[PDB]
Paper text:
At the cell division site, [name] protofilaments form a highly dynamic, membrane-bound structure, the Z-ring, which serves as a scaffold for the recruitment of the extra-cytoplasmic cell wall biosynthetic machinery. Here we investigate the physiological function of [name] [name], the only cell division-associated protein from Actinobacteria known to interact with the conserved C-terminal tail of [name]. Our structural data revealed the [name]-binding pocket, defining the [name] homodimer as the functional unit, and suggesting a reversible β-sheet-mediated oligomerization interface possibly regulated via an alpha helical switch. We found that [name] filaments and lipid membranes have opposing effects on [name] polymerization, pointing to a complex dynamic role of the protein at the division site, involving [name] bundling, Z-ring tethering and membrane reshaping activities that are needed for proper Z-ring assembly and function.
To further investigate this hypothesis, we removed the helix and crystallized the resulting [name]ΔML,Δα3 construct alone and in complex with FtsZCTD. Despite a different crystal packing, the two structures did show a dimer-dimer association mediated by the opposing β-sheets in the crystal, generating linear [name] polymers similar to those observed for the B. subtilis homolog. These observations demonstrate that the β-sheet is indeed prone to self-interaction in solution and suggest that the amphipathic helix α3 might regulate [name] polymerization. In our hands, [name] [name] devoid of helix α3 (i.e., with the β-sheet accessible for protein–protein interactions) remained dimeric in solution and we were unable to detect higher order assemblies by size exclusion chromatography or analytical ultracentrifugation.
Author numbering:
A (entry chain A), B (entry chain A): 65 to 136
The structure:
């Protein structure tokens, strides 16, 4: 069974849990921050860095509004 | 062998890895943000929330400049 990257269009910092749940279960996540304020985008990236640290994953910047988190 | 909470006096956002390493190994961490700028304190708390989410831990606010992360 294939494990396609989970795409997430973010709406607020509360959606950090959507990236977190998928990544915690072992899925790569690609997320879009273009509907967020500058403040909330920063918050998401910091939360995602904490996810990656905890589970030994890697965060990749695709562009100014698109990042991916990839499991170990 | 006892597992005493790890106290961390933070100096920059780079010290998120000090909270992260201890919490990832299963230690509770109590950290002080009184030497940080407002910007960096926010960044630390968001990174710590990502750590807690990933490993099913809990973050507790002690006061405006002191928080703890506790493993599951």
């Amino acid at each position: 069974y294939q494990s396609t990257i989970v795409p997430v269009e973010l709406h607020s910092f509360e959606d950090a849990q959507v990236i977190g749940g998928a990544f915690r279960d072992g899925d790569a996540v690609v997320f879009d921050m273009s509907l967020l304020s500058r403040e909330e985008a920063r918050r998401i990236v910091d939360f995602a860095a904490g996810l990656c640290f905890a589970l030994r994953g890697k965060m990749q910047k695709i562009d100014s509004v698109t990042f991916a988190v990839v499991p170990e």
